[PDB]
From a paper:
The E. coli 50S large ribosomal subunit is composed of 33 proteins (L-proteins), one 23S and one 5S rRNA.
In order to distinguish states very similar in composition, additional structural elements were added to their names (e.g., d1_L4/L23, densities for domain I plus uL4 and uL23 etc.). To exemplify in more detail how certain L-proteins contribute to 50S assembly, we compared states d1, d1_L4 and d1_L4/L23. Thus, uL4 and uL23 appear to contribute to the formation of local seeds to promote further assembly of domains II and III, respectively. Defined regions of domains II and III show density in states d1_L4 and d1_L4/L23, respectively, before subsequent concerted appearance of their remaining densities.
Author numbering:
A (entry chain Y): 1 to 60
B (entry chain 2): 10 to 44
C (entry chain T): 1 to 67, 74 to 93
D (entry chain S): 2 to 82, 98 to 110
E (entry chain E): 4 to 42, 94 to 201
F (entry chain U): 1 to 102
Write the structure that this text describes.
RNA sequence: GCGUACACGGUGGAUGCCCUGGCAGUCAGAGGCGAUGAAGGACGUGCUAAUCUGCGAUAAGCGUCGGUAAGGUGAUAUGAACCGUUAUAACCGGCGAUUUCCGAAUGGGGAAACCCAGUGUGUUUCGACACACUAUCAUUAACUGAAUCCAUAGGUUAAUGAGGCGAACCGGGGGAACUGAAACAUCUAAGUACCCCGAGGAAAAGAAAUCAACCGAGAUUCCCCCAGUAGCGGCGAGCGAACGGGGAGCAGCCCAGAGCCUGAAUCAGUGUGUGUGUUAGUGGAAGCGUCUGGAAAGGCGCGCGAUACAGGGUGACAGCCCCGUACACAAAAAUGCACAUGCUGUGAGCUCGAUGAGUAGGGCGGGACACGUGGUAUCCUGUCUGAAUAUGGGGGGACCAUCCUCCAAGGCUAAAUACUCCUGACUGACCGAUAGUGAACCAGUACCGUGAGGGAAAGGCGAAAAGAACCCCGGCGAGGGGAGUGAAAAAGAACCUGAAACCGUGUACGUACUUAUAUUCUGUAGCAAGGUUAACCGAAUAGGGGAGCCGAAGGGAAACCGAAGUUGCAGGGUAUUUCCUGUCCAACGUUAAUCGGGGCAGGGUGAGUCGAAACAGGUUAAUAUUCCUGUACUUGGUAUCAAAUCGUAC
């Protein structure tokens, strides 16, 4: 988890993070605004994942 | 607008009097030094 | 408008209200929150990219928060669709 | 022995005291009949207190409903911010 | 009167036999108590006189015991406990010369038992404890220092 | 390095549960220890139409300080001290009185 | 109608108890932070309506390495929802990235969190977006370069120390009044308050052309004694010394111009390896029964460890319940100090000569020096004069004679030393919410004032929320009564004990001279012609430290004859968003108001044709010519598309 995605090149990391931002964040926000999403751990999980991904791509 | 021009943060800080009164207010610890 | 990260950071979440509820069926109009900027073209492009719903007219207005405590003023956007509808 | 006290009543002490002075030592039914037509504002409050007391007594001491008698009714000055008051009623068959 | 070797010890009369001076002892103890970092200096000769007077008072009450030696083979508090139980001593003081590391280490936890060297003897320690156990070398060191 | 953890048997030294054994369920972040059948309470739950209210009076368990309970070992049948000792690769708890291994 | 005493209650806040708080000190660090963006603020920051705290669009957290690791997702303060449980849950620490805006702010404007620029690079779509750069002295050299051919003044280029904040202190320059003289001039007041300046953690000074004079030791820096003595002072109040005689520490050197042998201790910065601290941590002893007691840690009985009875929590005071203490250990990486170790530069002593020339001094005029130019001493002027070099110079105590450290016109010198904005540890015969801090509480908060500035009241449930289920009256509120948890509800949240003052019903009867410097007297005690030793050393009220302050085999005229004082103490006197929707009558309405001119939560403002271009109708509880209905109209690009931000209620 912490280092599983370290080896893969930058292009796939960028693709994954942009896909996450475009789909998961928007879906979670829509569900939260509409009253759905009884479980909110998805927001924290995606936020942590994107933070980890963007922390890379600069030192590499 | 006269109040802002006269006792504004920048208006005071322009002169040394504003800086010293700001330091005194900081020492006192009031939430707002000027407004 | 080559970059796509900027546009997707404008809209935050939809707004739910009785007037919005009536509008969703009166003319298939929706209300979506946006960021400080009021770039109508960018908002339309982002909506088209995300929901794949064509938009013809977007109406933007500014709302000031109510109080000392203060809240950031927010931009309200009404978007209408020809025939498609989305959540 | 049934006790019922209403606290923080928004009424001056003197008016409630002088209203209750006309009910102390008299039968519950007779006092109720007298106060049915009373127009004083404190009359409504004292009626509420006494009817609540009688209802509680019947709920817990339903026996001998007819012979209920007013025993110890009084008013005391209440918290001051229009000074409030506390109206207390103790009622029993004897 | 060593109580262990039936050996008598020679002591100066002026040390353990001088007349008790209540006022001087009271002044010295008051000064010592007040000299605990609360808002007194005492003359050296007055201090020596107070120490000699209190020692004489304790001697005439049979509250002081002298032994040939006092040491523990190992730094174990059990040995000291057994040794003090042998003489039926519970709240007593130990006065000696050079401080023994093992004995001091073992006696550290004992609230009722405290060990001190000849040079580090004070009226408070002597009075706070019912009896004191002393050694001949300690006796002569005290005689020399107090004069 | 808590001396009490999940899935253990303990005995309440004092607090109306003297001589009665129990099984520890969980320990609160503040040190409170919950042990089955040590202190039964009749808390009155606030009625609520939603959340599938059980109704009546809920018979849950209260919380007591860990100081009032002690580890129990079936080898001797009496509570004793518990210490920590280093094993070949890890550190594990152990009792006293010949130091039965956990 | 009242009174004489008690009980039952109320606004009630003194006493009693609690401290998650303050106040006074000691020991060490640091003794400052900051454009690679300081201190302080605005705004976001979670499943969340508000606060502390962390964080800064990666926003109660992200990457790597170590400890514990089965609980955790920080708390107020619950609830829904998840991960892991033997090493990728979470917590702590080293090393890094991110580090919104204002704030010296330093891209421009500007009103703090607001609006808008220029340069290079990055460009699946050169419309749009991302990173870096910006305003100041001269120095290195260059592009260069008027007056004035060269040259200079000046602009630019790549770097260097700075242009702010912060408690005290070093030294210097300015700088008033209040005061004794019952007012006042010289003094004191007072070099006091206050402003500025150089860098600092300490600073200045710091090693003799200094002192007595015919005898001596010479660095500066602080301290008791000398000495509160001389002297000054309407000789009154008061101020106030040194060569001299003891402790902390005591290191004097560099150039002065030539050489000799020289990379010879050593200086300053950077690797290597060890130890001891810091930045997470591990192990670390022992008991029960019995009786009250809600609960024992309380009484009683017998035992155990103790290198650990310091301390805290645990249903009442606990060595043997837990956390801890001493003690024994521990560092992947960073970090202060010690050394041996490698390198870029000064980097041992010896001989030859010397003591730093417009220099000291003097004449035209003034600085604080009481001395304003008076007989007038001290740096020097805008100005003139002005000999040397141990063979010479300065100083004297009567001058001649004779004596003394030393060599002035080049510099430095960490050692003992004042202070605490802050960090870590401890103590207090210090205080208990009108005390203690202005503030123990969401306090430098509410509140007052244009600003400056001034500045409060308000702390407490319960051992454990186990927070009164359930039922009834009641208006679905508010409130109360049964039952029950609870020891106790004479603990019910407006929540510790609860007195009076004031108001109700019943009961028996009539109707405020302060620490402190001295003087004197009283008691008490050591020693004894002796004791008393200050500052300091010090295993610390022990032992040393008699450079002092008094008395005395002396008295006496200095011819002569031959004993008892001090210091410790205690006692005393004297000298000084207002629009609408849902809720409510509680803060207000000169009665009530379930009414409102009143609080809370939500909603509402829609633009190419409102600021060359739009007319009529409809719209919700409030907005329109803006949203829909009929299309029309000005401009531009390619029948088709577009014309930004900003306010449209009152």
């Amino acid at each position: 988890m912490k280092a599983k995605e370290l080896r893969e090149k930058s292009v796939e990391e960028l693709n994954t993070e942009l896909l996450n931002l475009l789909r998961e964040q928007f879906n979670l926000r829509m569900q939260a605004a509409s009253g759905q999403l009884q479980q909110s751990h998805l927001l924290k999980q995606v936020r942590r994942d994107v933070a980890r991904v963007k922390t890379l791509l600069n030192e590499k | 607008l006269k109040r802002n021009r006269s006792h504004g943060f920048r208006a005071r800080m322009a002169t040394k009097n504003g800086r010293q009164v700001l330091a005194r207010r900081r020492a006192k610890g009031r939430a707002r030094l000027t407004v | 408008m080559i970059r796509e990260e900027r546009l997707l950071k404008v809209l935050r979440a939809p707004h739910v209200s009785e007037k919005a509820s009536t509008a969703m069926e009166k003319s298939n109009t929706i209300v979506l929150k946006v960021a400080k900027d009021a770039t109508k073209a960018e908002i339309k492009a982002a909506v088209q990219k995300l929901f794949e719903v064509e938009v013809e007219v977007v109406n933007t207005l500014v709302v000031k928060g109510k109080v000392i405590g203060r809240r950031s003023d927010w931009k309200k956007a009404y978007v209408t669709l020809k025939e498609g509808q989305n959540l | 022995e049934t006790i019922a006290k209403h606290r923080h009543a928004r009424s001056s002490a003197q008016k409630v005291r002088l209203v209750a002075d006309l009910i102390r030592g008299k039968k519950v039914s007779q006092a109720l009949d007298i106060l049915t037509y009373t127009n004083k504002k404190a009359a409504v409050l004292v009626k509420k207190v006494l009817e609540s007391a009688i209802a509680n007594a019947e709920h817990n001491d339903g026996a001998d409903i007819d012979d209920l008698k007013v025993t110890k009714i009084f008013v005391d000055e209440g918290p001051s911010m229009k000074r409030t008051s506390h109206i207390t009623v103790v009622v029993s068959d004897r | 009167v060593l109580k262990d070797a039936q050996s008598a010890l020679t002591v100066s009369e002026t040390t353990f036999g001088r007349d008790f001076n209540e006022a001087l002892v009271h002044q010295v103890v008051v000064a010592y108590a007040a000299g605990a970092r609360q808002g007194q200096k005492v003359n050296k000769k007055m201090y020596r006189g107070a120490l000699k007077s209190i020692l004489s008072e304790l001697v005439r009450q049979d509250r002081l015991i002298v032994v040939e030696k006092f040491s523990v083979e190992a730094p174990k508090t059990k040995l000291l406990a057994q040794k003090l139980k042998d003489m039926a001593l519970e709240d007593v003081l130990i006065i000696t010369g050079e401080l023994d590391e093992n004995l001091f280490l073992a006696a550290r936890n004992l609230h009722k038992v405290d060990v001190r060297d000849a040079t580090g003897i004070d009226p408070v320690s002597l009075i706070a404890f019912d009896k004191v156990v002393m050694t001949a070398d300690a006796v002569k060191q005290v005689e020399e220092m107090l004069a | 390095a808590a001396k009490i953890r999940r899935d253990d048997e303990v005995i309440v030294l004092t607090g109306k549960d003297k001589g009665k054994r129990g099984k520890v369920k969980n320990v609160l972040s503040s040190g409170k220890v919950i042990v089955e059948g040590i202190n039964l309470v009749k808390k009155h739950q606030k009625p609520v139409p939603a959340l599938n209210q059980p109704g009546g009076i809920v018979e849950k368990e209260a919380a007591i300080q860990v100081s009032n309970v002690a580890i129990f070992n079936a080898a001797t049948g009496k509570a004793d001290r518990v210490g920590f000792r280093f094993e070949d690769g890890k550190k594990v708890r152990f009792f006293k009185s010949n130091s039965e291994t956990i």
